[PDB]
Amino acid sequence: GRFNPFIHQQDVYVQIDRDGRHLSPGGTEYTLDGYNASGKKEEVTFFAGKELRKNAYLKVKAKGKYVETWEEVKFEDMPDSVQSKLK
Template sequence: MKKFIFGLVLVGGIVVGGPILGSKLTEGQVSTQNNDLGQVFDRFNVTIKKEPSYVVTNSKYGTKQEPGGYLYTQKAINESGKSYDLTFYAPGELRENAILKLDTKGRFVETWEEVKKEDVPKNVVDKL
């Protein structure tokens, strides 16, 4: 019975602690087409909460991908006003100077949508 409990605690520690440690170790890494490990760790990290972030699109931040789509890496601002680097994928080139609301969990972007300036919190609009 002791071995079973020890095994259960060990597996639980790895499942919960792995993403937390991984998020810390990959901080500052920029995601690329071939390296999105930081996003994966943030997605499963229980200490990171989901929150919306905002960006203003600009083609200079987009990189055309093969076989298609664009990978955008740029500064995002979350609702608390913190600015950080974020990478997200779009199936095509985005409209210039559009405001996007990204549903994020750390560096992981679940979804994004174009929003109007009036729909963005005041403290975020001031920093965009």
């Protein structure tokens, strides 16, 4: 294999518009369609340590294709083209 140090961050914006699925112990999985910071369509699978509120907006931060973190955001603070696609 070949490994490089050229780290590409992406942030995928989603709405919690599908049911989660429990993952024992204490996890909730979501697989949702979303948009990155440049408005490109993405699919993201991520886990939270609690069940998230229906219709909340989330930012999921990734390095390469690997998801690292989730964070709740408000609609009005998401990227403009993401707001247009997720409204």
